[PDB]
Every structure is written in C-alpha cells, then in structure tokens.
Amino acid sequence: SVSILRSSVNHREVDEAIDNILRYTNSTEQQFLEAMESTGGRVRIAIAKLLSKQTSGGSGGSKLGGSGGSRKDLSVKGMLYDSDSQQILNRLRERVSGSTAQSA
C-alpha cells in the first residue's frame, strides 16, 4: 500500500495574512496594493507608509547616539530561503486585480 495525494492550500493562509494586514493598518486591499507598488513590494515598508500617511508633526527629529564598537556583521556562511514578499504581492495583486478568481 501507498499514501494518498494531498494538495496544499497556502494561498488562503497568505490571503488571511493579507486580510490581517488590512485589519492592522485600517485599510483596503486596494490601498495595500498601491502601498506595495509604491514601496517595491517590501511588506514592512508598505505597512509602515500605510500607517504613517497622516501624523501629528513636530519642530524636528529627536536626539540619538551611542558608544563605539565592531561591525557586528556575524559569519558569512548560511543557507537561502524564500522572501515571502513576492507571495504576499502575488496574492494581493490577484485579490485586487481579479478577486483571486479562476478566470478573468
């Protein structure tokens, strides 16, 4: 005997994560698609710009500083993995452009 076939559903989990980004940023998927298009598909920069689109303002920036040290850059060796930004952008653009429908 052998195991049965089992297809994945991870585009719904990415769609749920997109929906939770709309909920977190108090926005629409159209506004999040426009924020992603404006920021080059970086979800962190897109949600940052989509939050900070209107603010209280001020007279200038705050004071910053710290002690000297090394580069803290760590070892060069490692392994590659997917960035997820492109998967979120694909599911967001299909949800906005064509409702994630089977034909358009």
Instruction: Supply the DSSP string of 32-82, one letter for each residue.
Output: HHHHHHHHTT-HHHHHHHHHTTS----SSPPP------------S------
Q: Which two tokens stand for residue 96?
A: 């906005």
Contacts of 38 (CB under 8 A, 6+ apart): 46, 49
Q: Which two tokens stand for residue 16?
A: 């749920």
| Domain limits for position 6 | 1-104
Total count of domains within the chain? 1
- At 83 the three-state DSSP class reads coil
Domain at 75, CATH number: 1.10.1050.20
